[PDB]
Amino acid sequence: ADNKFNKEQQNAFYEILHLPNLTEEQRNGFIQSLKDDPSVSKEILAEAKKLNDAQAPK
Ligand SMILES: [Zn+2]
Ligand SMILES: [Zn+2]
């Protein structure tokens, strides 16, 4: 089994890598979830974006 990312999973991994307002604990947890099972990428990305947006500088 070849486990190189589909587009979909890649765009989510990079997004998560680069969301600016996550703490590294938070980021690492989301990345670990995608490592574990890349098929949950959609849901994990949506959570990560919510959390990023909630923590934006104001
Ligand atoms: Zn940052
Ligand atoms: Zn302000």
Taking a C-beta distance cutoff of 8 angstroms, is the pair 24, 31 a contact? no
Q: What is the DSSP string of 1-58?
A: ------HHHHHHHHHHHH-TT--HHHHHHHHHHHHH-GGGHHHHHHHHHHHHHHT---
User: Rounded CA gap, 12 and 14, in Å?
Assistant: 6
C-alpha of residue 58 to centroid of ligand 2, in Å: 4
The approach used to solve this structure was X-ray
C-alpha of residue 4 to centroid of ligand 1, in Å: 27
**Residue 27, CB-side half-sphere exposure with 13 Å CA sphere:** 14
Kindly list the structural domains of the chain, giving each domain's residue range(s) and its CATH number in brackets, ordered by start: 1-58 (1.20.5.420)
CA dihedral (42, 45, 47, 51) in degrees, to 10, reads -170
User: Rounded CA gap, 56 and 58, in Å?
Assistant: 6
